[PDB]
Design a protein around this ligand. Structure first.
Ligand code: ATP
Ligand code: ATP
Lengths: 108, 204, 48, 96, 113, 403, 359
């Protein structure tokens, strides 16, 4: 038959719409999924992934490292005002913290 | 009233959350990479009819030295090889781009005595070496490790015994293989363990 | 490169031919759903 | 006799390699990159689930998905996510 | 067939977060040293023996003229012609809408890392 | 790169012809064409060739895959040029297949014949093995070809044939045809070729046919009758035969299912173990009554001997790139059986891999497909033997140019 | 909206069959000839000026003089239809039984450079007809005035290794009937008569399977020698050329050409196919082209093949009643198709890659 086109490709996404919708079809998140839910969900998922990978890589470069470590994730998700909010109640393994030293605990 | 008029899903998402005149032509073209002037025909646009062929750069001739008659006579002379016996090797070298697994098979065994791959390789290499040696002085890198034929004759051979081993040496060898561990464990787990126990019982 | 290109082209054109056969099969059974649609419109006329 | 386990590593490297051509990503950082995707997927799908159920609906839809993205992501985060998805649904229903 | 770039969606500037002020200086500095740079597209030894040469007397470091009286002129940097405009983000100058287009696509914000 | 040029693959059983860059040949027709010495007159399209004729020869111009009857060969190429291609030969370069064991005299004679009789602009004579390698996407591999006349293993290494590695066996489609003759005779089957039947009626399994013979039949000669019967036999080979997945076992073959078959006159019956016994002779010729002798090599042994005659350094490549071709390889379980026996007899130090082509066009016309792809590359447009090469160097140019 | 605006053309050396597509009969029909001075008319004008014009067929049993004659035929085709070309011109066009690479490059170069068609597609006539036949596969015989095909198309593709051809459908049978007459004084002496010798077929080709009937009738013939109206007003009765002429579609040697007929041609064609897939070529046996409008030849394509084929498979003849036009219909069904547009060739890829595009 026709050369089969995927659902990540037709829409123009990298995250698997087939796999996303798939977790949804047998995920009981609902009872009869439509034909746009996985597309929107994957699009936004991967959008946030890109949003963060950006800040993580930029901080990494600030550290003169070419590989993103979990530190390049703690520093980032705490450096950006809205990523921190979204991931406020999330601990990133082996990420560390940001060097926020209280002003009153300094040399005087 | 609802404007809509577009796709259901996209519509809901958007509102619910408010002359070519370039003639190709059948065209003659000559390949500048060829010396015979052969004219071929091609499917080119109108706007490039007359440009040089773009596949003539993929013509990097493998380099092979070309000894002359005088040069050969002086230095390339070899009691076991004649000029008729040696020019053929270089012709095959060039026509097969200096590869010696395919030069061998097409060797002329009718006028020529039978040679292995290693001897042909060593012969051509001594020829290349002495050709550059005629130069030598012009910084001709007299450091060439020309292909070892002796060790390599062996190295070809002592793979062949391991190539055709129906069982045992392919099958039974597993045993000796395991023994490599055993022979490397139980002896020291023997004579050394004994010596350690002798000292332990000596202090005890 | 060109052998993979040839294989892709042959595979692609065989699939294209098969889905044209399938598409025309769908068009023909739609050209019978046409008669069914006329009959259903007549039943709707009875209901009207 | 294999025990294969799925993950998002293949598409987080497509997106990363595309949005940072020179930058790699460590295996441990890709684990975080995977967990993040699964977490947000859970959040958005759960909020769309609740959205559909509140309106007495048996189907989670992309309209509910957009409203759940409006509820979940903060203001800008939302705007960008909603725009990206919205434009991805009109590029998909136009048979491109 | 498809528009064939939504897959890579490189910039997607909903979160653009401009680079400015000191970053501009960094770029300026970088460009300067690149114009001062060498074949590859000993300098550490030069800097070392120059930091041996630091003193207040007449020497290498104290032989610098300084700022000019005649003020700096604008130039376009895409075609090099006089440039009435400045790029709002990075501060580099240009002279047309076309030049701003090229600059936004290749040199604005992209080489600030 | 791709120019209006003609690809010819002249097999012992059929000839394929077409243009460069096609997925499939423009035409394929029997090489064993028909002739009457009228000069002589020839018939090639199967519609004029299957006519029962006042005189007949069924001449078959090629001997052991090589040209011997140059007149009938010329007639074949003439008819091909103006019946299926329908183009002037002086316009299109010609790429043509040949057997790897073809002699220099034949190459030179074909070169001068091509340039003098067909006035062609350029020429390229290439061996079936290299073409088959190009068709299967590899520069190195063992090319196994089980054709009509002989089954041959030819090593290609870096695009060149290893003459010392060629191994050939007469166990081939014609040998299968002989086995079918013998089996039909031992089953007392009334084989009737299709041309003879005016009409027929249905009959029970194993019962003789109920048919009427045509009244207008002339006194056809023996050779053409043999050809027609052999065509029915080769249809039977497609229809009924199947290789045993492993070494032939009379008990297992007795347990294996039958295949029902019918001959043109209407005689019909089930075939059992025999349809598996015939192809076994291709893989182990020892159990072949009438052909006793240990000098014969079967398909798998042809392969292993061919690779074993090469340098041990290139045997890993050859075993890792076994490319299988020829019509006989379409027999059911042929490739599975070959893979099994080669997995048993390939040394453990080396990987075994068979390229996974399966289509009729692939298996048979790999040589033509190789011509099609080869004639479609810029790097190849400098390899042509041009008409100038011939006018300057003479008939011998084909020896100085491409191997 | 290129399916809705689709145009279809087929030259038809006996009669052209073209038009704005989507309906079941051609809009444009003309005898597909080019007239020149003896010492440029193409539409029912050369057929009258035959006595003062040198007439040439742009058809050569599957080959054409692609530049002059074909461009004139296309140019005329538009005048035999809505003349919509400057507003819309998406096309699919006349094509050979076997000449894709050599035809299509020049053909599409002319059509994109002269006729500037926004969309093009090309395919084998039998593959067009298959989509009137409404099934995946068949022997489609694809007859006409110029060729006698036996192309065994499978799953929408014309497998060229099994495609065979024959040369007895048009001109040959017309001349054969012309020289069967002159035996009885019917006076078909010149081309003006030849052009209605090919219309005697409208009535005379026999009603049933006839290879024995032609023997049985000849001894005591009455009330079967149907008359035909000559242009001279004569109504002469027709003799055993009630059977002589069409017989040669199945006994070419009876016309004097050394071959076996369409039944054997098709049987050999399907015999060169795969052993499994030919099960469907038996299950889908199909007829097309004007020469298949005879009644009895359908019974021939049943019985003459049943005599050769095995008893297990049956002969499912599904010849459409309007088989004169099943190419036209099928091509139309292919061209006027809502979701087919993805398979047009268009002026951007033509410009980026040339007439040597994959088509
Ligand atoms: N479908 C089939 N199934 C089984 N065997 C087949 C089939 N078709 C052909 N054969 C066998 O293959 C033989 C022909 O093989 P093929 O067409 O590959 O030879 P060829 O190209 O003439 O060979 P060569 O190039 O070696 O001279 C026929 O004699 C018949 O024995
Ligand atoms: N009305 C008719 N009744 C019966 N047979 C006919 C009729 N019209 C034409 N024929 C036969 O069919 C032939 C023409 O058929 P058709 O019009 O389908 O061919 P065409 O399209 O002109 O040919 P080609 O496809 O070779 O170019 C005529 O030569 C005659 O043999």
């Amino acid at each position: 038959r026709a050369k089969a086109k995927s659902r990540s490709s037709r829409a123009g996404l990298q995250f698997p719409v087939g796999r996303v919708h798939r977790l949804l079809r047998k995920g009981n998140y609902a009872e009869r999924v439509g034909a746009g839910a996985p597309v929107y969900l994957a699009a936004v998922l991967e959008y946030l992934t890109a949003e963060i990978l950006e800040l993580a890589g930029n901080a990494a470069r600030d550290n003169k490292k070419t590989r993103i470590i979990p530190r390049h994730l703690q520093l980032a998700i705490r450096n950006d005002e809205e990523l921190n909010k979204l991931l406020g109640r999330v601990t990133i393994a082996q990420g560390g913290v940001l060097p926020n030293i209280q002003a009153v605990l300094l040399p005087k | 009233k609802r404007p809509e008029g577009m796709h259901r899903e996209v519509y809901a998402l958007l509102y619910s959350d408010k002359k070519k005149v370039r003639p190709w032509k059948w065209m003659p073209f000559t390949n500048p990479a060829r010396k015979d002037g052969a004219m071929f025909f091609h499917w080119r646009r109108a706007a490039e009819e007359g440009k040089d062929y773009p596949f003539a750069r993929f013509n990097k001739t493998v380099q092979v030295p070309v000894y002359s008659e005088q040069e050969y006579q002086l230095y390339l002379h070899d009691d076991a090889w004649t000029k008729a016996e040696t020019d053929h090797l270089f012709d095959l070298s060039r026509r097969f781009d200096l590869r010696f697994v395919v030069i061998h098979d097409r060797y002329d065994h009718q006028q020529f005595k039978k040679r292995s791959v290693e001897d042909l390789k060593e012969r051509y290499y001594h020829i290349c070496a002495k050709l550059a040696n005629v130069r030598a002085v012009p910084g001709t890198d007299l450091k060439i490790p020309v292909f070892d034929a002796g060790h390599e004759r062996r190295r070809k051979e002592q793979l062949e015994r391991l190539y055709n081993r129906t069982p045992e040496q392919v099958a039974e060898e597993e045993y000796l293989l395991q023994e490599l561990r055993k022979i490397e464990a139980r002896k020291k787990e023997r004579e050394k363990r004994s010596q350690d126990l002798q000292k332990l019982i000596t202090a005890a | 490169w060109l052998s993979a290109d040839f294989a892709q082209e042959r595979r692609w054109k065989r699939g294209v031919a098969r889905k044209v056969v399938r598409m025309v099969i769908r068009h023909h059974e739609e050209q019978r759903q046409k008669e069914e649609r006329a009959r259903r419109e007549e039943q709707a006329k009875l209901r009207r | 006799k294999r025990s294969r386990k799925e993950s998002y590593s293949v598409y987080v490297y497509k997106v990363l390699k595309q949005v940072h051509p020179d930058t790699g990503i460590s295996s441990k950082a890709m684990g975080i990159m995977n967990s993040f995707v699964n977490d947000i997927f859970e959040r958005i799908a759960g909020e769309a689930s609740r959205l559909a159920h509140y309106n007495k609906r048996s189907t989670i839809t992309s309209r509910e998905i957009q409203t759940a993205v409006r509820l979940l992501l903060p203001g800008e985060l939302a705007k960008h996510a909603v725009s990206e998805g919205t434009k991805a649904v009109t590029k998909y229903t136009s048979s491109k | 067939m498809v528009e064939k770039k939504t897959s890579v969606r490189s910039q997607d500037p909903g979160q653009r977060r401009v680079l400015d002020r000191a970053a501009r200086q960094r770029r300026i500095n970088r460009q300067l040293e690149a114009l001062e740079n060498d074949n590859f597209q000993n300098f550490q030894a030069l800097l070392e023996e120059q930091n041996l040469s630091v003193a207040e007397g007449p020497n290498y470091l104290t032989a610098c003229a300084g700022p000019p009286s005649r003020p700096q002129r604008p130039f376009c940097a895409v075609c090099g012609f006089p440039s009435p405009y400045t790029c709002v983000s990075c501060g580099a100058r240009y002279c047309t809408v076309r030049c701003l287009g090229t600059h936004q696509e290749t040199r604005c914000l992209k080489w600030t890392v | 790169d791709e120019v209006g040029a003609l690809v010819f693959d002249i097999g012992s059983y059929t000839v394929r012809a077409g243009y460069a860059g096609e997925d499939c040949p423009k035409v394929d027709f029997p090489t064993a064409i028909g002739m009457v010495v009228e000069g002589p007159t020839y018939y090639i399209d199967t519609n004029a060739l299957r006519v029962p004729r006042e005189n007949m020869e069924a001449i078959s111009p090629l001997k052991n895959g090589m040209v011997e009857d140059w007149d009938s060969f010329q007639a074949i190429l003439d008819h091909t040029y103006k019946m299926h291609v329908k183009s002037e030969a002086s316009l299109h370069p010609v790429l043509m297949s040949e057997a790897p064991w073809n002699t220099r005299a034949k190459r030179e004679k074909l070169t001068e014949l091509m340039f003098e009789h067909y006035n062609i602009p350029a020429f390229f004579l290439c061996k079936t093995a290299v073409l088959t390698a190009f068709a299967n996407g590899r520069s190195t591999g063992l090319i196994l070809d089980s054709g009509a006349t002989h089954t041959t293993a030819i090593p290609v290494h870096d695009g060149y044939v290893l003459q010392q590695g060629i191994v050939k066996s007469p166990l081939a489609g014609d040998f299968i045809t002989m086995q079918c003759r013998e089996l039909f005779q031992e089953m007392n089957i009334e084989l009737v070729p299709p041309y003879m039947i005016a009409s027929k009626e249905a009959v029970r399994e194993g019962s003789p046919a109920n048919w009427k013979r045509k009244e207008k039949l002339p006194q056809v000669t023996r050779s053409w009758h043999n050809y027609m019967c052999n065509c029915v036999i080769q249809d039977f080979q497609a229809s009924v035969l199947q290789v045993s997945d492993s070494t032939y076992d009379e008990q297992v073959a007795a347990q294996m299912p039958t295949v029902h078959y019918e001959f043109p006159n209407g005689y019909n019956c089930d075939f059992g173990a025999e349809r598996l016994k015939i192809p076994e002779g291709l893989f182990d010729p020892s159990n072949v009554k009438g052909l006793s002798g240990n000098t014969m090599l079967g398909v798998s042994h042809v392969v292993t001997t061919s690779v074993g005659m090469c340098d041990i350094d290139i045997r890993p490549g050859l075993y890792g790139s076994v490319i299988v071709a020829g019509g006989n390889t379409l027999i059911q379980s042929f490739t599975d059986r070959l893979n099994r026996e080669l997995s048993q007899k390939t040394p453990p130090s080396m990987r075994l891999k068979l390229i996974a082509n399966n289509t009729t066009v692939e298996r048979r016309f790999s040589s033509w497909i190789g011509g099609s792809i080869l004639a479609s590359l810029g790097t190849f447009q400098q390899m042509w033997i041009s008409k100038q090469e011939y006018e300057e160097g003479g008939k011998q140019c084909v020896e100085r140019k491409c191997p | 909206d290129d399916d809705i605006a689709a145009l279809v053309v087929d030259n038809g050396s006996g009669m052209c069959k073209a038009g704005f597509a989507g309906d079941d009969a051609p809009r444009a029909v003309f005898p597909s000839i080019v007239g020149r001075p003896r010492h440029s008319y193409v539409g029912d004008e050369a057929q009258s000026k035959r006595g003062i014009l040198t007439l040439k067929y742009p058809i050569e049993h599957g080959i054409v003089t692609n530049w002059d004659d074909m461009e004139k035929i296309w140019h005329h085709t538009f005048y035999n239809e809505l003349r919509v070309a400057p507003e819309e011109h998406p096309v699919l066009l006349t094509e050979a039984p076997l000449n894709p690479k050599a035809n299509r490059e020049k053909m599409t170069q002319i059509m994109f450079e002269t006729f500037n068609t926004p969309a093009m597609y090309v395919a084998i006539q039998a593959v067009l007809s298959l989509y009137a036949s409404g099934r995946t596969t068949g022997i489609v015989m694809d007859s006409g005035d110029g060729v006698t095909h036996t192309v065994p198309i499978y799953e929408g593709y014309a497998l060229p290794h099994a495609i065979l051809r024959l040369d007895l459908a048009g001109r040959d049978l017309t001349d054969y009937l012309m020289k069967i007459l002159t035996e009885r004084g019917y006076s078909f002496t010149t081309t003006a008569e030849r052009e209605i010798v090919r219309d005697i077929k409208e009535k005379l080709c026999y009603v049933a399977l006839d290879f024995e009937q032609e023997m049985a009738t000849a001894a005591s013939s009455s009330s079967l020698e149907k008359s035909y109206e000559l242009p001279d007003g004569q109504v002469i009765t027709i003799g055993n050329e009630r059977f002589r002429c069409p017989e040669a579609l199945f006994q070419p040697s009876f016309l004097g050409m050394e071959s076996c007929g369409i039944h054997e041609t098709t049987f050999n064609s399907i015999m060169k196919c795969d052993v499994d897939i030919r099960k469907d070529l038996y299950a889908n046996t199909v007829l097309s082209g004007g020469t298949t409008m005879y009644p009895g030849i359908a019974d021939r394509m049943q019985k003459e093949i049943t005599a050769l084929a095995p008893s297990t498979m049956k002969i499912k003849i599904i010849a459409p009643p309007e088989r004169k036009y099943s190419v036209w219909i099928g091509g139309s069904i292919l061209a006027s198709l809502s979701t087919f547009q993805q398979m047009w060739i268009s002026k951007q890829e033509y410009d980026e890659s040339g007439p040597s595009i994959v088509h």
